[PDB]
Amino acid sequence: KTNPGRFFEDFRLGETIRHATPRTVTTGDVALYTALYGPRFTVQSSDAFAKTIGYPASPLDDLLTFHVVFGKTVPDVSLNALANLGYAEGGFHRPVYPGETLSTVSEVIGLKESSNRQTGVVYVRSTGSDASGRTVLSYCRWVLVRKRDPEAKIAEEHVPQLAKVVNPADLAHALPPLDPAAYDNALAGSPHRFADYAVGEKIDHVDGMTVEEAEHQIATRLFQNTAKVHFDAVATKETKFGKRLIYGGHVISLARALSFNGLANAFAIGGINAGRHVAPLFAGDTVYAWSEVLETAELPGRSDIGALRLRTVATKNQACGAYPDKQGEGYDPSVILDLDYWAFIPRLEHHHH
Amino acid sequence: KTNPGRFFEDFRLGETIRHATPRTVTTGDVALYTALYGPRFTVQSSDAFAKTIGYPASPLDDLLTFHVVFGKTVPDVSLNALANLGYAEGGFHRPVYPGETLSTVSEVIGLKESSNRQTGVVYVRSTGSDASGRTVLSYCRWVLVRKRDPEAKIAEEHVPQLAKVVNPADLAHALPPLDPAAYDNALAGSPHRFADYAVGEKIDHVDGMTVEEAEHQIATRLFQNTAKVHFDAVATKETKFGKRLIYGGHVISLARALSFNGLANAFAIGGINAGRHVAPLFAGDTVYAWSEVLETAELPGRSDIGALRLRTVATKNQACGAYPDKQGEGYDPSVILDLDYWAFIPRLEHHHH
Amino acid sequence: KTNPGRFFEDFRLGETIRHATPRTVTTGDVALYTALYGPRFTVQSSDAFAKTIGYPASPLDDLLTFHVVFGKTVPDVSLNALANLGYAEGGFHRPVYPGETLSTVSEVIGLKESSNRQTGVVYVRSTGSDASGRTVLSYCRWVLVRKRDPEAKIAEEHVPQLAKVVNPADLAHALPPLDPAAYDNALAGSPHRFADYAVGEKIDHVDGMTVEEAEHQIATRLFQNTAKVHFDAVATKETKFGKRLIYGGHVISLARALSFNGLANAFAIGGINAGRHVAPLFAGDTVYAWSEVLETAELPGRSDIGALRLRTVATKNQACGAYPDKQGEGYDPSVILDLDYWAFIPRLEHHHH
């Protein structure tokens, strides 16, 4: 029963993995998520405010939902990962409330050995469901995993093909009918509505967050994400980094929190277009971030909210006033994340019943 | 939309700031507050105990209420602070329960440039309200803030004038009618009641707490307090301290927790007379504290509880058996906080209906 | 009122201590316990899953119950401890739910001075009760405590005599009637039931956890455990270790979490036979663990669950594939804990009403 877990040669294309340890998310998790990342989006922070605008109660931060659903997959898929690399085709179907239980099922949809035959990239489609089987989250990710025995031979290889953009039209049925007049701009922390954003606008978030060892471990276990490279200062000595790698998701959550400085009314996340973990983060490193409007979509059947398509780029140890990005055939050396996603935002303020 | 925040030259006397991100405080926050500071006051720790003595449920620790209400003001007032300096005229109007939402409004009531023209002291009156607009917390604080451009000229300057003591008579209507017979001294951890304290009594708390980097960051984000000097190990290199300053409130909470060793039945805080952040705390530094009875007040219209006026002084890296205080024209070098406040305490144990 | 606490010479055999600060355990504590230790046992993690199998709601992790009940005793017994040493005769009478309040009473049942006359071992029987006085936890522990004055003389000395095994027959009335068919092996993360374990089976847990300073302090205060040696980087300089000792219970919780890798369906703990803190853990040290089946007991009056008797041994900085244990007259140098306990596990999967 000694189980070092699954390695790259153990995956067979088209297998469905029915992940263990479904997770009841409570106001315990909300309070710890708030203290690990410091997000200040009022919909999630204030029940009073959420209720007035047309929610039943504050919904979970969409990234608390995401890290929990991802977490459940880690024991089977990425326990023996060296790094999670990217995402595509992400959809937040349903908002999630404290007391709800989240479960995850993954489908192996790609496998590509690395040239050294020491590792492969595993591609999965992961689907999270509430206790009654209703989908709440769908996404694709790919992660670089260890082979147990490098001399082993990779049966079938397949780099799958993924939409680099989700279609706003399928995100329309996500958020319940809201009241954009009840939405109190002063309590939400910005006057800027759907119509105040221009395609091409660039936003430095200014604020920096230095990440301590204990912070990312406490976050990573909260998600019940077991990837040994987060936790084992002994074993990681024998990796390329030689020390504990911070959960990629920790950077996504930190960048989202910072993004409140300019995008406070992008209150909920509807889907993920593309994401890429460019570079790893270590304890003692400082995160900064900057964002861009790529599209501004109206939602078929709705006038309360539209959708912003956004690109957010995070750095370590480098302010983003100069908007760091590409630099030759690759990124500026300070870039650690490049995330392309749809958020929701209120439209008009005219009171209706 | 790139916003480095408000600087000293941006404040205009008499402006009202209506702060963003109102905060629903849950049993998540209570559990994290308990783990960040270790307070052992039974009223807050045990619903069973609170209910018996005449509360509807355990109330929030008054400093969890305080750090949340302060927190909401930080983005507008002290995001660009170098240090929060003092308090006066603090009143805990109403106890607060899990599920309640807290909002903050501040009034700029003072401005004084520093001699180097690099900084000014900003004086505010901050008022926290529940979701229905009822006041729960009022206080005055002053914080040393950065000027964006030092060559800038300060229009109007005003060091306001503040009562160095709150009047017990206005704290009477705070706590609901309690049962001081139901109050179980063994469960509360002290036999000492209102009548067992003498004016002039001095209490060393003995216990020390060493504060790690991750602890104060996790606490400071829980309060959604954004002051860059807490978080940015890069930017703080260019400050006088050259490293992250620990939230002043973290020291107040730690000193209050330690104070359980001698003041266990000073179960709730009614108001704040004067407070002064004497000196900063850094990661790795050890806190100790000692307290003094300054007054013992009966409350107009009540026999269940009286009010102790208390002075609590915290040190770093120095036990308080010698009761460190002043030392010439200024404090003993180890002193970091000097806090003068009213707490509540049960009187007589005679059972009534 | 300056109280450095109780020292070895202050205990009198046969005294009952009625401990202060009873503790309401909430979903705040559950979420923080989950993030401090990362346990993935589905009964505790998923209400949905617990309810289906025959609980009213997820019960508290038995070690969250244990650390809280132990915590309440620390101010009186072990505030001035150098190290907690062992356990015997542990019984989890009743599972515990969020909202319940826990109180502790201890009986001094042993005292033995150390040869240097600087310290003694104090032996206690500690009993935790819900708010209505019903017992939930009973155990014996012994801890090495400081004498205030070494020249002091120890009146009565007594090393009591303790059963090295609890009897499965008295654990039968602990867990409510469950449904072992409703128990979803895929959601619980193991197909192995009562009947799949063999006496003599050995299980390496593979996974390692490196423990940071802030992690054990945040955990130790959550339990409201005050032992100065956990917290005071100044005072601990003058101890044999010269630095902060990590709560022994932190190692028990970490080893239990790791043990999910092979014992996922040992879902609840019924009692503790023997436990020994072999060696201390420090910040930066990495924990690993391995377990053994010692007995497999059926429960008088029940067919849903049986009892496994288990031995789990934790190490620091040494993988357990070689199953480290004894090595001459004493343990392998890497061993830090040797814990002998009864857990519960489902039997047959045949659906009944």
Coordinates of N, CA and C in Angstrom, one line a residue, chain C residues 140-320:
Chain C
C140 N -4.6 9.8 29.4 CA -3.5 10.1 30.4 C -2.3 10.6 29.5
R141 N -1.7 11.6 30.1 CA -0.4 12.1 29.5 C 0.6 12.4 30.7
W142 N 1.9 12.4 30.4 CA 3.0 12.8 31.3 C 3.9 13.8 30.5
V143 N 4.3 14.9 31.2 CA 5.0 16.0 30.6 C 6.1 16.4 31.6
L144 N 7.4 16.6 31.2 CA 8.5 17.1 32.0 C 8.3 18.7 32.2
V145 N 8.1 19.1 33.4 CA 7.8 20.5 33.9 C 9.0 21.0 34.7
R146 N 9.2 22.3 34.7 CA 10.2 23.1 35.4 C 9.8 23.1 36.9
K147 N 10.8 23.0 37.8 CA 10.7 23.5 39.2 C 11.0 24.9 39.2
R148 N 10.3 25.8 40.0 CA 10.5 27.2 40.1 C 11.9 27.4 40.9
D149 N 12.0 26.8 42.0 CA 13.2 26.7 42.9 C 13.7 25.3 42.9
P150 N 14.9 24.9 42.3 CA 15.4 23.6 42.5 C 15.8 23.1 43.9
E151 N 16.1 24.0 44.8 CA 16.4 23.6 46.2 C 15.1 23.1 46.9
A152 N 14.0 23.4 46.3 CA 12.6 22.9 46.9 C 12.6 21.4 47.0
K153 N 11.8 20.8 47.9 CA 11.7 19.4 48.2 C 10.3 18.8 47.8
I154 N 10.4 17.7 47.1 CA 9.2 17.1 46.5 C 8.5 16.2 47.6
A155 N 7.4 16.6 48.2 CA 6.6 15.9 49.2 C 6.4 14.4 48.7
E156 N 5.4 14.2 47.9 CA 5.0 12.8 47.5 C 5.3 12.6 46.0
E157 N 5.9 11.4 45.7 CA 6.3 11.0 44.4 C 5.6 9.6 44.1
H158 N 5.2 9.4 42.8 CA 4.3 8.4 42.3 C 4.3 8.3 40.8
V159 N 4.9 7.3 40.2 CA 4.8 7.0 38.8 C 3.7 6.0 38.6
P160 N 2.4 6.5 38.1 CA 1.3 5.6 38.2 C 1.4 4.5 37.2
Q161 N 0.4 3.5 37.1 CA 0.5 2.3 36.3 C -0.7 2.3 35.3
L162 N -0.3 2.2 34.0 CA -1.3 2.5 32.9 C -1.3 1.4 32.0
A163 N -2.6 1.0 31.6 CA -2.9 0.0 30.6 C -2.1 0.4 29.3
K164 N -1.3 -0.5 28.8 CA -0.6 -0.3 27.5 C -1.5 -0.6 26.3
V165 N -2.8 -0.9 26.5 CA -3.8 -1.1 25.4 C -5.2 -0.9 25.9
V166 N -6.0 -0.2 25.2 CA -7.5 0.0 25.4 C -8.2 -1.2 24.8
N167 N -9.4 -1.5 25.3 CA -10.1 -2.7 24.8 C -11.2 -2.3 23.8
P168 N -11.1 -2.7 22.6 CA -12.0 -2.5 21.5 C -13.5 -2.5 21.9
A169 N -13.9 -3.4 22.8 CA -15.2 -3.6 23.3 C -15.8 -2.3 23.9
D170 N -15.0 -1.4 24.4 CA -15.5 -0.1 25.1 C -15.6 1.0 24.1
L171 N -15.1 0.8 22.9 CA -15.1 1.8 21.8 C -16.3 1.6 20.9
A172 N -17.1 0.5 21.1 CA -18.2 0.1 20.2 C -19.3 1.2 20.2
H173 N -19.5 1.9 21.4 CA -20.6 2.8 21.6 C -20.3 4.2 21.2
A174 N -19.1 4.4 20.5 CA -18.6 5.7 20.1 C -19.3 6.2 18.8
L175 N -19.2 5.5 17.7 CA -19.7 6.0 16.4 C -21.1 5.6 16.3
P176 N -22.0 6.5 15.7 CA -23.4 6.2 15.6 C -23.6 5.0 14.5
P177 N -24.8 4.5 14.3 CA -25.0 3.4 13.4 C -24.7 4.0 12.0
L178 N -23.8 3.4 11.2 CA -23.4 3.9 9.9 C -23.9 3.0 8.8
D179 N -23.8 3.4 7.6 CA -24.2 2.6 6.4 C -23.0 2.3 5.5
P180 N -22.3 1.1 5.7 CA -21.1 0.8 4.9 C -21.2 0.6 3.4
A181 N -22.5 0.5 2.9 CA -22.8 0.4 1.5 C -22.8 1.8 0.9
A182 N -23.3 2.8 1.6 CA -23.4 4.3 1.2 C -22.0 4.9 1.0
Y183 N -21.1 4.4 1.9 CA -19.6 4.7 1.9 C -19.0 4.4 0.5
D184 N -18.7 5.5 -0.2 CA -18.3 5.5 -1.6 C -16.8 5.5 -1.6
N185 N -16.2 4.3 -1.9 CA -14.8 4.1 -1.8 C -14.0 5.0 -2.7
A186 N -14.5 5.5 -3.8 CA -13.8 6.4 -4.7 C -13.7 7.8 -4.1
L187 N -14.8 8.3 -3.5 CA -14.9 9.6 -2.7 C -14.0 9.4 -1.5
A188 N -14.0 8.3 -0.8 CA -13.1 8.1 0.4 C -11.6 7.9 0.0
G189 N -11.3 7.4 -1.2 CA -9.9 7.4 -1.8 C -9.2 6.1 -1.6
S190 N -9.9 5.0 -1.2 CA -9.4 3.7 -1.0 C -10.5 2.6 -1.1
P191 N -10.2 1.5 -1.8 CA -11.1 0.4 -1.8 C -11.0 -0.5 -0.6
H192 N -9.9 -0.4 0.2 CA -9.6 -1.3 1.3 C -10.5 -1.1 2.5
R193 N -11.2 -2.1 2.9 CA -12.2 -2.1 4.0 C -11.6 -2.9 5.2
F194 N -12.4 -3.0 6.3 CA -11.9 -3.7 7.5 C -11.1 -5.0 7.1
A195 N -11.7 -5.8 6.2 CA -11.3 -7.2 5.9 C -10.1 -7.2 5.0
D196 N -9.6 -6.0 4.5 CA -8.5 -6.0 3.5 C -7.2 -5.7 4.2
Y197 N -7.2 -5.5 5.6 CA -6.0 -5.3 6.4 C -5.6 -6.6 7.0
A198 N -4.3 -6.9 6.9 CA -3.7 -8.1 7.6 C -2.8 -7.5 8.8
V199 N -3.1 -8.1 10.0 CA -2.1 -8.0 11.1 C -0.7 -8.3 10.6
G200 N 0.3 -7.4 10.9 CA 1.7 -7.5 10.4 C 2.0 -6.6 9.2
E201 N 1.0 -6.2 8.5 CA 1.1 -5.3 7.3 C 1.9 -4.0 7.7
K202 N 2.8 -3.6 6.9 CA 3.7 -2.3 7.0 C 3.4 -1.4 5.8
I203 N 3.3 -0.1 6.1 CA 2.9 0.9 5.1 C 3.8 2.2 5.3
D204 N 4.7 2.4 4.3 CA 5.4 3.7 4.2 C 4.4 4.7 3.6
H205 N 4.3 5.9 4.2 CA 3.4 7.0 3.7 C 4.1 7.9 2.7
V206 N 5.4 7.7 2.4 CA 6.1 8.4 1.3 C 6.2 9.9 1.5
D207 N 5.1 10.6 1.7 CA 5.0 12.1 1.6 C 5.8 12.7 2.8
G208 N 6.4 13.8 2.5 CA 7.1 14.6 3.6 C 6.5 16.0 3.7
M209 N 6.5 16.6 4.9 CA 6.0 18.0 5.2 C 7.1 18.7 6.0
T210 N 7.6 19.8 5.4 CA 8.6 20.7 6.2 C 7.8 21.7 7.0
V211 N 8.1 21.9 8.2 CA 7.3 22.7 9.2 C 8.0 24.0 9.5
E212 N 7.4 25.1 9.1 CA 7.9 26.5 9.3 C 7.5 27.0 10.7
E213 N 8.3 27.9 11.3 CA 8.0 28.6 12.6 C 6.5 29.0 12.7
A214 N 6.0 29.8 11.8 CA 4.7 30.4 11.9 C 3.6 29.3 11.9
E215 N 3.8 28.2 11.2 CA 2.8 27.1 11.1 C 2.5 26.5 12.5
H216 N 3.5 26.2 13.3 CA 3.3 25.5 14.6 C 2.8 26.6 15.6
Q217 N 3.2 27.8 15.4 CA 2.7 28.8 16.4 C 1.3 29.0 16.1
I218 N 0.8 29.1 14.9 CA -0.6 29.5 14.5 C -1.5 28.3 15.0
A219 N -1.0 27.1 14.8 CA -1.7 25.8 15.3 C -1.8 25.8 16.8
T220 N -0.7 26.1 17.5 CA -0.6 26.0 18.9 C -1.5 27.0 19.6
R221 N -1.5 28.2 19.1 CA -2.5 29.2 19.6 C -3.9 28.9 19.3
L222 N -4.2 28.3 18.1 CA -5.6 27.9 17.8 C -6.1 27.0 18.9
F223 N -5.3 26.1 19.5 CA -5.7 25.1 20.5 C -5.7 25.9 21.9
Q224 N -5.2 27.1 21.8 CA -5.1 28.0 23.1 C -4.2 27.3 24.1
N225 N -3.2 26.6 23.5 CA -2.0 25.9 24.3 C -0.9 27.0 24.5
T226 N -0.6 27.3 25.7 CA 0.2 28.5 26.1 C 1.7 28.1 26.4
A227 N 2.1 26.9 26.2 CA 3.5 26.4 26.7 C 4.5 27.3 26.2
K228 N 5.2 28.1 27.0 CA 6.1 29.2 26.7 C 7.2 28.7 25.7
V229 N 7.6 27.5 25.8 CA 8.7 26.9 24.9 C 8.3 26.9 23.4
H230 N 7.0 27.0 23.1 CA 6.5 27.1 21.7 C 6.7 28.5 21.1
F231 N 6.8 29.5 21.9 CA 6.5 30.9 21.5 C 7.7 31.9 21.7
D232 N 8.6 31.6 22.6 CA 9.5 32.7 23.1 C 10.9 32.4 22.7
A233 N 11.3 32.9 21.5 CA 12.6 32.7 20.9 C 13.7 33.3 21.9
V234 N 13.3 34.3 22.8 CA 14.3 34.8 23.8 C 14.5 33.8 24.9
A235 N 13.5 33.4 25.6 CA 13.5 32.5 26.8 C 14.1 31.1 26.4
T236 N 13.8 30.6 25.2 CA 14.2 29.3 24.8 C 15.7 29.2 24.5
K237 N 16.3 30.3 24.2 CA 17.8 30.4 24.1 C 18.4 29.7 25.4
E238 N 17.9 29.9 26.6 CA 18.4 29.3 27.8 C 17.9 27.9 28.1
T239 N 17.3 27.2 27.1 CA 17.0 25.8 27.2 C 18.0 24.9 26.5
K240 N 18.1 23.7 26.8 CA 18.9 22.6 26.1 C 18.8 22.7 24.6
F241 N 17.7 23.0 24.0 CA 17.5 23.1 22.6 C 17.9 24.5 22.1
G242 N 17.7 25.5 22.9 CA 18.2 26.9 22.6 C 17.3 27.6 21.6
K243 N 16.1 27.1 21.3 CA 15.2 27.6 20.3 C 13.8 27.0 20.5
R244 N 12.8 27.5 19.7 CA 11.4 27.1 20.0 C 11.1 25.6 19.7
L245 N 10.6 24.9 20.7 CA 10.2 23.5 20.5 C 8.8 23.5 19.8
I246 N 8.6 22.7 18.8 CA 7.3 22.5 18.1 C 6.4 21.6 18.9
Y247 N 5.2 22.0 19.2 CA 4.1 21.3 19.9 C 4.2 19.8 19.4
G248 N 4.4 18.9 20.4 CA 4.3 17.4 20.1 C 3.1 17.1 19.3
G249 N 1.9 17.6 19.7 CA 0.7 17.3 19.0 C 0.7 17.6 17.5
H250 N 1.6 18.6 17.1 CA 1.7 19.0 15.7 C 2.2 17.8 14.9
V251 N 3.1 17.1 15.5 CA 3.8 15.9 14.8 C 2.7 14.8 14.7
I252 N 1.9 14.6 15.8 CA 0.8 13.6 15.8 C -0.1 13.9 14.6
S253 N -0.6 15.1 14.5 CA -1.5 15.6 13.5 C -0.9 15.4 12.1
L254 N 0.4 15.8 11.9 CA 1.1 15.7 10.6 C 1.2 14.2 10.2
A255 N 1.5 13.3 11.2 CA 1.7 11.9 10.9 C 0.4 11.3 10.5
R256 N -0.7 11.6 11.2 CA -2.1 11.2 10.9 C -2.4 11.6 9.5
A257 N -2.2 12.9 9.2 CA -2.5 13.3 7.8 C -1.7 12.5 6.8
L258 N -0.4 12.4 6.9 CA 0.4 11.6 5.9 C -0.2 10.2 5.8
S259 N -0.7 9.6 6.9 CA -1.2 8.2 7.0 C -2.4 7.9 6.2
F260 N -3.1 9.0 5.7 CA -4.1 8.9 4.7 C -3.6 8.2 3.5
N261 N -2.3 8.2 3.2 CA -1.6 7.5 2.1 C -1.5 6.0 2.6
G262 N -2.5 5.2 2.5 CA -2.6 3.8 2.9 C -3.7 3.4 3.9
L263 N -4.2 4.4 4.6 CA -5.2 4.2 5.7 C -6.4 5.2 5.6
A264 N -6.8 5.6 4.3 CA -7.8 6.6 4.0 C -9.1 6.2 4.7
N265 N -9.4 4.9 4.8 CA -10.7 4.3 5.3 C -10.7 4.1 6.8
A266 N -9.5 4.3 7.4 CA -9.4 4.4 8.9 C -9.8 5.9 9.2
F267 N -11.1 6.1 9.1 CA -11.7 7.5 8.9 C -11.8 8.3 10.3
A268 N -12.0 7.6 11.4 CA -12.2 8.2 12.7 C -11.3 7.4 13.7
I269 N -10.8 8.1 14.8 CA -9.9 7.5 15.9 C -10.8 7.2 17.1
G270 N -10.8 6.0 17.6 CA -11.6 5.6 18.7 C -10.9 5.7 20.1
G271 N -9.5 5.5 20.1 CA -8.8 5.6 21.4 C -7.3 5.6 21.2
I272 N -6.5 5.8 22.3 CA -5.0 5.8 22.2 C -4.5 4.8 23.2
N273 N -3.6 3.9 22.8 CA -3.1 2.8 23.6 C -1.9 3.3 24.4
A274 N -0.8 3.6 23.6 CA 0.4 4.2 24.1 C 0.8 5.3 23.1
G275 N 1.4 6.4 23.5 CA 2.1 7.3 22.6 C 3.4 7.8 23.4
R276 N 4.4 8.1 22.6 CA 5.7 8.5 23.2 C 6.3 9.6 22.2
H277 N 6.5 10.8 22.7 CA 7.4 11.8 22.0 C 8.9 11.5 22.2
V278 N 9.5 10.8 21.2 CA 10.8 10.3 21.3 C 11.9 11.4 21.2
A279 N 11.6 12.5 20.5 CA 12.6 13.4 20.1 C 11.9 14.7 19.6
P280 N 12.5 15.9 19.8 CA 11.8 17.1 19.4 C 11.9 17.5 18.0
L281 N 11.0 18.3 17.4 CA 11.0 18.8 16.1 C 11.3 20.3 16.1
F282 N 12.0 20.9 15.1 CA 12.3 22.3 15.1 C 11.9 22.8 13.7
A283 N 11.6 24.1 13.6 CA 11.3 24.8 12.3 C 12.4 24.5 11.3
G284 N 12.0 24.1 10.1 CA 12.9 23.7 9.0 C 13.0 22.3 8.9
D285 N 12.7 21.5 9.9 CA 12.7 20.0 9.9 C 11.5 19.4 9.1
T286 N 11.8 18.3 8.3 CA 10.8 17.6 7.5 C 10.3 16.3 8.2
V287 N 9.0 16.2 8.3 CA 8.3 15.0 8.9 C 8.0 14.0 7.8
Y288 N 8.2 12.7 8.0 CA 7.8 11.4 7.3 C 7.3 10.4 8.3
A289 N 6.6 9.4 7.9 CA 5.9 8.5 8.8 C 5.6 7.1 8.2
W290 N 5.4 6.1 9.0 CA 5.0 4.8 8.5 C 4.2 4.1 9.6
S291 N 3.3 3.1 9.2 CA 2.3 2.6 10.1 C 2.4 1.0 10.0
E292 N 1.7 0.3 11.0 CA 1.7 -1.1 11.1 C 0.3 -1.6 11.7
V293 N -0.2 -2.7 11.2 CA -1.4 -3.3 11.8 C -1.0 -4.2 12.9
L294 N -1.5 -3.9 14.1 CA -1.1 -4.7 15.3 C -2.3 -5.7 15.7
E295 N -3.5 -5.2 15.5 CA -4.7 -6.0 15.7 C -5.8 -5.6 14.8
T296 N -6.8 -6.5 14.5 CA -8.0 -6.2 13.7 C -9.2 -6.8 14.5
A297 N -10.0 -5.9 15.2 CA -11.0 -6.3 16.1 C -12.4 -6.0 15.5
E298 N -13.3 -6.9 15.7 CA -14.7 -6.8 15.4 C -15.3 -6.0 16.7
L299 N -16.4 -5.4 16.5 CA -17.0 -4.6 17.7 C -18.3 -5.3 18.2
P300 N -18.3 -5.7 19.4 CA -19.5 -6.3 20.0 C -20.8 -5.4 19.7
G301 N -21.8 -6.0 19.0 CA -23.1 -5.4 18.8 C -23.2 -4.7 17.4
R302 N -22.2 -4.8 16.6 CA -22.0 -3.9 15.3 C -21.5 -4.8 14.2
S303 N -21.9 -4.5 13.0 CA -21.4 -5.1 11.7 C -20.9 -4.0 10.7
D304 N -21.3 -2.8 10.9 CA -20.9 -1.6 10.0 C -19.4 -1.4 10.0
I305 N -18.9 -1.2 11.2 CA -17.4 -0.9 11.4 C -16.8 -1.9 12.3
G306 N -15.5 -2.2 12.0 CA -14.6 -2.8 13.0 C -13.6 -1.8 13.4
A307 N -12.6 -2.2 14.2 CA -11.5 -1.4 14.8 C -10.2 -2.0 14.3
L308 N -9.3 -1.2 13.7 CA -7.9 -1.5 13.6 C -7.1 -1.0 14.8
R309 N -6.3 -1.8 15.5 CA -5.2 -1.3 16.3 C -4.0 -1.0 15.4
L310 N -3.4 0.2 15.5 CA -2.3 0.7 14.6 C -1.1 1.3 15.4
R311 N 0.1 1.0 14.9 CA 1.3 1.7 15.3 C 1.8 2.6 14.2
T312 N 2.0 3.9 14.4 CA 2.5 4.9 13.4 C 3.7 5.5 14.0
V313 N 4.8 5.5 13.3 CA 6.1 6.1 13.7 C 6.5 7.2 12.8
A314 N 6.7 8.4 13.3 CA 7.2 9.5 12.5 C 8.7 9.8 12.7
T315 N 9.3 10.3 11.7 CA 10.8 10.7 11.6 C 10.8 12.1 11.3
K316 N 12.0 12.7 11.5 CA 12.4 14.0 10.9 C 13.6 13.7 9.9
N317 N 13.5 14.3 8.8 CA 14.6 14.4 7.8 C 15.1 13.0 7.3
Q318 N 14.2 12.1 7.2 CA 14.5 10.7 6.8 C 13.2 9.9 6.4
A319 N 13.1 9.7 5.1 CA 12.1 8.8 4.5 C 12.0 7.5 5.2
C320 N 10.9 6.8 5.1 CA 10.5 5.6 6.0 C 10.3 4.4 5.2

